[PDB]
Design an enzyme around this catalytic site. Structure first.
Site, PDB file in Angstrom:
ATOM      1  N   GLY A 246       6.236  -5.827  31.323  1.00 58.08           N
ATOM      2  CA  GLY A 246       7.180  -6.913  30.908  1.00 58.08           C
ATOM      3  C   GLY A 246       6.560  -7.779  30.982  1.00 58.08           C
ATOM      4  O   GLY A 246       6.489  -8.536  32.229  1.00 58.08           O
TER       5      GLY A 246
ATOM      6  N   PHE B  55       8.885 -12.842  24.152  1.00 55.61           N
ATOM      7  CA  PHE B  55       9.337 -11.921  23.129  1.00 55.61           C
ATOM      8  C   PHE B  55       8.522 -10.817  23.144  1.00 55.61           C
ATOM      9  O   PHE B  55       7.414 -10.937  22.908  1.00 55.61           O
ATOM     10  CB  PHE B  55       9.633 -12.291  22.324  1.00 55.61           C
ATOM     11  CG  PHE B  55      10.375 -13.333  21.521  1.00 55.61           C
ATOM     12  CD1 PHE B  55      10.979 -15.128  22.443  1.00 55.61           C
ATOM     13  CD2 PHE B  55      11.867 -12.456  21.753  1.00 55.61           C
ATOM     14  CE1 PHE B  55      12.153 -15.416  22.047  1.00 55.61           C
ATOM     15  CE2 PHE B  55      13.217 -13.471  21.427  1.00 55.61           C
ATOM     16  CZ  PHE B  55      13.462 -14.884  22.514  1.00 55.61           C
TER      17      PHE B  55
ATOM     18  N   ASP C 131       0.689 -22.193  25.377  1.00 48.68           N
ATOM     19  CA  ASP C 131       1.622 -21.898  26.680  1.00 48.68           C
ATOM     20  C   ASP C 131       0.363 -20.827  28.001  1.00 48.68           C
ATOM     21  O   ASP C 131       0.538 -20.385  28.169  1.00 48.68           O
ATOM     22  CB  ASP C 131       2.263 -20.099  26.166  1.00 48.68           C
ATOM     23  CG  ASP C 131       2.992 -19.724  27.337  1.00 48.68           C
ATOM     24  OD1 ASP C 131       3.868 -20.873  27.857  1.00 48.68           O
ATOM     25  OD2 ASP C 131       3.753 -18.864  27.400  1.00 48.68           O
TER      26      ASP C 131
HETATM   27  O1  LIG Z   1      -3.922  -6.079  29.916  1.00 49.97           O
HETATM   28  C1  LIG Z   1      -3.272  -6.587  29.187  1.00 49.97           C
HETATM   29  N1  LIG Z   1      -3.993  -7.035  27.865  1.00 49.97           N
HETATM   30  C2  LIG Z   1      -2.546  -7.930  27.239  1.00 49.97           C
HETATM   31  O2  LIG Z   1      -2.946  -8.714  25.806  1.00 49.97           O
HETATM   32  C3  LIG Z   1      -1.709  -8.775  28.709  1.00 49.97           C
HETATM   33  C4  LIG Z   1      -0.420  -8.994  27.800  1.00 49.97           C
HETATM   34  C5  LIG Z   1       0.321  -9.421  26.063  1.00 49.97           C
HETATM   35  N2  LIG Z   1       0.784  -9.836  26.988  1.00 49.97           N
HETATM   36  C6  LIG Z   1       1.487 -10.959  27.895  1.00 49.97           C
HETATM   37  C7  LIG Z   1       1.189 -11.842  28.389  1.00 49.97           C
HETATM   38  C8  LIG Z   1       0.835 -12.686  30.128  1.00 49.97           C
HETATM   39  C9  LIG Z   1       0.473 -11.815  30.404  1.00 49.97           C
HETATM   40  C10 LIG Z   1      -1.374 -10.467  30.284  1.00 49.97           C
HETATM   41  N3  LIG Z   1       0.445 -10.110  28.532  1.00 49.97           N
HETATM   42  C11 LIG Z   1      -2.061  -7.691  29.553  1.00 49.97           C
HETATM   43  C12 LIG Z   1      -1.396  -7.691  30.429  1.00 49.97           C
HETATM   44  C13 LIG Z   1      -1.805  -7.353  32.146  1.00 49.97           C
HETATM   45  N4  LIG Z   1      -0.959  -6.955  32.887  1.00 49.97           N
HETATM   46  C14 LIG Z   1       0.278  -7.382  31.897  1.00 49.97           C
HETATM   47  C15 LIG Z   1       1.644  -7.579  33.422  1.00 49.97           C
HETATM   48  C16 LIG Z   1       2.546  -7.581  32.058  1.00 49.97           C
HETATM   49  C17 LIG Z   1       2.354  -8.049  30.726  1.00 49.97           C
HETATM   50  F1  LIG Z   1       3.398  -7.765  30.244  1.00 49.97           F
HETATM   51  C18 LIG Z   1       1.596  -7.427  30.357  1.00 49.97           C
HETATM   52  C19 LIG Z   1       0.006  -7.861  30.682  1.00 49.97           C
HETATM   53  C20 LIG Z   1       1.610  -7.205  34.154  1.00 49.97           C
HETATM   54  N5  LIG Z   1       0.589  -8.818  35.236  1.00 49.97           N
HETATM   55  C21 LIG Z   1       0.309  -9.251  35.623  1.00 49.97           C
HETATM   56  O3  LIG Z   1      -0.171 -10.141  36.219  1.00 49.97           O
HETATM   57  N6  LIG Z   1       1.719 -10.513  35.648  1.00 49.97           N
HETATM   58  C22 LIG Z   1       3.193  -9.833  34.629  1.00 49.97           C
HETATM   59  C23 LIG Z   1       3.545 -11.305  34.250  1.00 49.97           C
HETATM   60  C24 LIG Z   1       4.441 -12.177  35.215  1.00 49.97           C
HETATM   61  C25 LIG Z   1       3.264 -12.361  36.865  1.00 49.97           C
HETATM   62  C26 LIG Z   1       2.213 -11.456  35.969  1.00 49.97           C
HETATM   63  C27 LIG Z   1      -0.615  -7.357  35.788  1.00 49.97           C
HETATM   64  C28 LIG Z   1      -1.580  -7.176  34.484  1.00 49.97           C
END
Ligand code: A1IYF
Ligand code: MG
Ligand code: MG
Ligand code: MG
Length: 323
Positions: free
Chosen positions: A9, A13, A122
């Site tokens: 989530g 995009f 960002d």
């Molecule tokens: O493990 C990863 N490898 C990546 O590339 C990657 C990734 C790719 N795009 C994004 C955008 C934002 C943050 C991380 N990512 C992650 C990745 C790791 N979590 C993610 C969470 C949501 C998500 F959508 C992607 C990931 C939840 N979470 C988190 O603390 N949140 C969620 C967003 C708002 C509150 C802060 C804990 C771990």
């Protein structure tokens, strides 16, 4: 090759899912985006270039089905955002060692990016992955990133609002990687305060909140941000902004607030550059051999500077950062 499960989530995009590489048994994150018929995906193209301890590793990518691009990236369980909310709920300051560790690693990653002429655009606590057990930090979410060289025109409305540089809200279309440096200051400020330093309800209100603390930029300062008149406002000393946190707390505050001031300069060219910032004495504690995490574990990787990092650091900063 992958067992895909559970959307994580994002607020941008593409859909990001937790998955398992069946070749390796490793939990990964997979970002799926619409792939253009003709054009390369700029995020993947940037990800393919980056190799850095504080940038999420590109593991793989494959195409599905237009069509879909799937970007397989290393999985990190938390973010600086989530760590901060914990401390906010516990009504507790983030320990200075963690603030130091996160700020150092964020500056390294962004220094490297800027060395390749890449602007992230960002930077925010949500985009800064963290593993609590080691306090490693890695930058991610390169969906807004751009190969930026000065003289390039780009979208103005580009960062997440709280972390957005003031030249962007003043309609500058020819900005620099210095906009990422303003975001660094905002994250540092948020780590020190517990809540966003500048929290506008609109983008215009964001500028006003900035002006209300830092004071009115001079007309000279206005032209460094956009070469194309604000009311006079009494700015607030940093010791005033952080007074409650200082009361409840080494010269760490003097050091942190010196660093804060140098990141948050109106003049984009006067902001302290991320790799030079690593030599700041705020980080001296990270360079002590005896220093450990509050839990007692070793510090994460900190001194493995790549050739490209060192070639973008003043000689003074190089000798200081390598212990
Ligand atoms: O493990 C990863 N490898 C990546 O590339 C990657 C990734 C790719 N795009 C994004 C955008 C934002 C943050 C991380 N990512 C992650 C990745 C790791 N979590 C993610 C969470 C949501 C998500 F959508 C992607 C990931 C939840 N979470 C988190 O603390 N949140 C969620 C967003 C708002 C509150 C802060 C804990 C771990
Ligand atoms: Mg192309
Ligand atoms: Mg492949
Ligand atoms: Mg730099």
């Amino acid at each position: 090759t992958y067992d895909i499960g559970r959307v994580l989530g994002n607020g941008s995009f593409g859909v990001v899912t937790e998955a398992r590489c069946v070749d390796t048994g490793e939990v990964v994150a997979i970002k799926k985006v619409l792939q253009d018929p003709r054009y390369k995906n700029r995020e993947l193209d940037i990800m393919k270039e980056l190799k850095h301890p504080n940038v999420v590793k590109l593991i793989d990518y494959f195409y599905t089905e237009n069509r879909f691009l799937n970007v397989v990236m290393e999985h990190i369980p938390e973010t600086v955002y989530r760590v901060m909310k914990s401390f906010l709920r516990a009504n507790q300051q983030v320990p200075f060692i963690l603030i130091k560790l996160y700020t150092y690693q964020m500056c390294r990653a962004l220094g490297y990016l800027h060395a390749l002429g890449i602007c992230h655009r960002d930077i925010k606590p949500q985009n800064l992955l963290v593993d609590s057990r080691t306090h490693v930090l890695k930058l991610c979410d390169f969906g807004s990133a751009k190969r930026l060289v000065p003289g390039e025109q780009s979208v103005s409305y580009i960062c997440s609002r709280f972390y957005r540089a003031p030249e962007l809200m003043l309609g500058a279309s020819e900005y620099t990687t210095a906009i990422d440096v303003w975001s660094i200051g905002c994250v540092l400020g948020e780590l020190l305060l517990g809540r966003p330093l500048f929290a506008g309800e609109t983008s215009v209100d964001q500028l006003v909140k900035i002006i209300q603390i830092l004071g009115t930029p001079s007309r000279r300062q206005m032209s460094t941000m956009n070469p194309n008149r604000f009311p006079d406002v009494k700015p607030r000393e940093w010791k005033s902004i952080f007074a409650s946190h200082i009361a409840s707390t080494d010269p760490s505050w003097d050091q942190a607030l010196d660093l804060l001031t140098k990141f948050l300069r109106y003049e984009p060219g006067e902001r302290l550059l991320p790799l030079e910032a690593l030599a700041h004495d705020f980080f001296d504690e990270l360079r002590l051999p005896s220093t450990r995490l509050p839990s007692g574990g070793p510090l994460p990787e900190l001194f493995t500077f790549s050739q490209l990092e060192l070639q973008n650091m003043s000689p003074a900063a190089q000798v200081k950062c390598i212990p």
